[PDB]
């Protein structure tokens, strides 16, 4: 759930040391590799050296996070972190000392900056946006996410909504459980009939994920409804020539329709077209990743515990 290209540069310490991080609405901790991680993966990424920062303070607290295909262990420090033109002082930063796992081998980011609720933060870790809200460094207690449909995009706006990135009106959906950015999806219909999320379901908006995940049974119904066929890689593909005649998949959220066109829910790479839906056999949680967010400019409002959606430019 960390394969999206929703990265950004951040700066930590005095003078600033630069890192690339995935901005992840599916988690809540900030961490980057430290100079004390000596593995190949770490040595060939940016590593924070606390000895070189005059504002660094060691918290005397550990951090350990497990991922599907890896884990990180490290230590926590305070330092100044700059993100999207906001300078965030006295910010807890996780600093890796080990990073086993394929996830880090195959990911271009140095670290992760979580944007979910503090309930998901590790012990002793304070989420970046929480620290910013607490210190009153943002104009409003919300942030906004634009992902450009074509090629690694594009913007994280902290403390504001940027109307230049959407058309039509912003519509709001209440958060149901304040951990992930979680809410109710009412239905998923295709060709005007119920296919998935029948009777409603729980979903999250997850900027860290490239695809759209759902329970396997429901997802298989979607693959069949869109005319996709399973291949030997375990993915589902379609004839690119059929995109013009394929159906829209409609996510209904708080009673309004959020259609995904065939071009939006498939990937086309040198004439090979694959479904952006992926099934999970061990979870009923729908994960609306970049497939969805590329189509819908997304506002994450902590003051009012709600998500705002509008059609992206
Ligand atoms: C903020 O950080 C400074 C050092 O940078 C420290 O002296 C101070 O105690 C911190 N403030 C709080 C409220 O933790």
Numbering used by the authors: 11 to 323
From the paper:
The doubly glycosylated variant 2 was used for the crystallization of camel chymosin. The crystals obtained by crystallization of variant 2 contained a protein lacking the first three residues of the N-terminus. The first ten residues are not visible in camel chymosin. The presence of the large charged Arg5 and Glu6 residues (Ser5 and Val6 in bovine chymosin) adjacent to each other precludes the participation of the N-terminus in the β-­sheet, as one of them must be buried in the hydrophobic core of the protein. In camel chymosin it blocks a major part of the binding cleft and must undergo a conformational change upon binding of substrate. The lack of hydrogen-bond partners for the β-strand formed by residues Leu166–Leu168 is compensated in camel chymosin by a slight displacement of the loop formed by residues 93–96, which enables the side chain of Ser94 to form a hydrogen bond to the carbonyl group of Leu166, thus connecting the β-strand to the loop 93–96. In addition, camel chymosin possesses a small positive patch on the C-terminal domain comprised of residues Arg242, Arg254 and Lys278 (part of the second patch); the corresponding residues in the bovine enzyme are hydrophilic but neutral.
Bovine and camel chymosin are aspartic peptidases that are used industrially in cheese production. They cleave the Phe105-Met106 bond of the milk protein κ-casein, releasing its predominantly negatively charged C-terminus, which leads to the separation of the milk into curds and whey. Despite having 85% sequence identity, camel chymosin shows a 70% higher milk-clotting activity than bovine chymosin towards bovine milk. The substrate-binding cleft and active site are located at the interface of the two domains.
